[model samples]
Target: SFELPALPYAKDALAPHISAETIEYHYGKHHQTYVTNLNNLIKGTAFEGKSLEEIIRSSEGGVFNNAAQVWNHTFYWNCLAPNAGGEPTGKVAEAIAASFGSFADFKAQFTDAAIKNFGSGWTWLVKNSDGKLAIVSTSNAGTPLTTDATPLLTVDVWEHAYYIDYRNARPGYLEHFWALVNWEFVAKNLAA
Candidate 1:
């Protein structure tokens, strides 16, 4: 019985960058559908009471798709904040420097990945098993959880994530994403 998690901030908190209407649909509708679908799909099955991550790691087909989407959207919301973005500080900054040469370089590469993803998907900054940072793009319900990388932060590149606000301007969407990123959350994920 998975439930939709509440948005971490007020619906309009990310406005101008991500509108209240977008959040209403993206979170209230789309995310809720994934939760309801996951619950229904796993009912009476071995995955019925498993944790979302457990279901994602152990199930396949429809079960995996819905579960992963629920988890991904939950994560995507946490990756944003009203007054977030700009350069990261502390260990996150150091790690970015070590991994991508500099923060500017990291942003450029991350932007490139988001723009060139080719379709509905997500772009993430993940910490690999070796404790290094890397940028990854996963199509559809794909996620870093399936691999050895530990997801730190993500930008939703799915059309529904930005289409209402950015229209066909994927690049514009990515540009604004940098302004709303929750670096504090990224730092926490890195520390974890």
Candidate 2:
């Protein structure tokens, strides 16, 4: 059975930017439910012991949704940190400039796409197979793992990700998202 991944920080760690109450529901409840659904759906089936990535790449319908969401939520949690944002550094920064012209342009485009994402979904900055940066959005249960791109960063635009704190304002939630991004994790992904 798949286990719920432990959070990288305390539930209260991302306070002000992200509240503990939001974490309690988004992580504790929503993410947990996805794992639970995945485990139960895979029981005694071909996917029973398969990796989440394997299931995501091969399964469809309910199995695919749960598996992909389980992985996505984990990635989202790690993408956040107590105080890790304020433009990137090193190769990542250079790559962003090469791919999107400048940090401000990249920021504007990513923010626009994220805020405009139709429904429950995600927006990501990824390393395309050509080894350049690009921004892309995926619908619910969609992810870059399905493509040749390697995800560098992501913002979960699901209302569950911010409804409690920001109410109906997705842009407001994103305004604070820049402050919680873990560039270190993005750097690690890049080096890998």
Candidate 1, run of 10 with poorest lDDT = 48-57
Which has the greatest lDDT?
1
Model 2, TM vs. native: 0.98
- lDDT per prediction? 0.93, 0.92
lDDT of 1 by residue, 108-141 (tens): 9999999999888999999999998999999999
Cα lDDT tens digits for candidate 2, 1-192: 999989999999998989999999999999999998888899999898677798899988999999999999899999999878899999889988998999889989999999999999999999988898889999998999999899889999989898999999999999899989899999898878
Flag regions of model 2 displaced more than 4 Å: none
Q: Alpha carbon lDDT of residue 90, candidate 2? A: 96
After the best TM-score superposition of candidate 1, give how far the Cα of residue 110 lies from its true spot, in angstroms.
0.3
